[PDB]
Amino acid sequence: DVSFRLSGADPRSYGMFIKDLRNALPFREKVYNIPLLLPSVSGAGRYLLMHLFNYDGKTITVAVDVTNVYIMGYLADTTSYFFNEPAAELASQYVFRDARRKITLPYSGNYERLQIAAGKPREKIPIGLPALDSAISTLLHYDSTAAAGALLVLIQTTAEAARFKYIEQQIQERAYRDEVPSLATISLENSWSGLSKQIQLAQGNNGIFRTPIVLVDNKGNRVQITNVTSKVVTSNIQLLLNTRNI
Numbered sequence: 001d002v003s004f005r006l007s008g009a010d011p012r013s014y015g016m017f018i019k020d021l022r023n024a025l026p027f028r029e030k031v032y033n034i035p036l037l038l039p040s041v042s043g044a045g046r047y048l049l050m051h052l053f054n055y056d057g058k059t060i061t062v063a064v065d066v067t068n069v070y071i072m073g074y075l076a077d078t079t080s081y082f083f084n085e086p087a088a089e090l091a092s093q094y095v096f097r098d099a100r101r102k103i104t105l106p107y108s109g110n111y112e113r114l115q116i117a118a119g120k121p122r123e124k125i126p127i128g129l130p131a132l133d134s135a136i137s138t139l140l141h142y143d144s145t146a147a148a149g150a151l152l153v154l155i156q157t158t159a160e161a162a163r164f165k166y167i168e169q170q171i172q173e174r175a176y177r178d179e180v181p182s183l184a185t186i187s188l189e190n191s192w193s194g195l196s197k198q199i200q201l202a203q204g205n206n207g208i209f210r211t212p213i214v215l216v217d218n219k220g221n222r223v224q225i226t227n228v229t230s231k232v233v234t235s236n237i238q239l240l241l242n243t244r245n246i
Ligand SMILES: Nc1nc2c(ncn2[C@@H]2O[C@H](COP(=O)(O)O)[C@@H](O)[C@H]2O)c(=O)[nH]1
Pocket: 068, 069, 070, 071, 072, 109, 110, 111, 112, 155, 159, 160, 189, 190, 193
């Protein structure tokens, strides 16, 4: 399991939690020195538990699929909550079995579905460590509309930060002040699958992407990523989705 406590959190402690979440995910090999997530894991071993504590010491436990860093559901006190999709239904066979009841949320975990339920796109929802405190507090007691925005914050401040050093650094800059995500943040979230696929295809193509990936960079400019010498590959991305799940 991994744990993060917002009471006493600072950029360094958050950074160390994100390093710890990455290291909790199994891999058999690295591609260009980046951990390649597994094609498949059978049974309860597919799920990492992340214990998150708000400023006041109240907690949820989040279930994460270690093949894709997708959040399946969470446990708040005696109630479990799972997204309305097959992977999360399967996860509910394995995790939070002792909950007194299981609620299926009225949406999948897809960004497009969560943004409709929340009534706003990611671009308009501040993120940061204070926003994660608020998200944990929101998820402690059921509210499906409020939970959708809380889950957008939770996904970006945990899973997206684990996938990209740049997004970890963005949340560190928001340790005490929330701010809507940068253009690059949104671009990297949207490009994780495509980048993962191109980096794996590059391994038999001399480090050259078979299909260049368009990103937004840290200055807000559109850039074409063509090969593994790009800073996105050498410094930024931290985990690869296996092409057997693309
Ligand atoms: N529940 C959940 N959804 C995510 C996560 N990361 C990204 N998504 C979003 O869920 C959707 C799945 O679609 P896809 O990844 O195939 O494009 C995407 O919008 C994707 O960016 C995550 O870590 N947990």
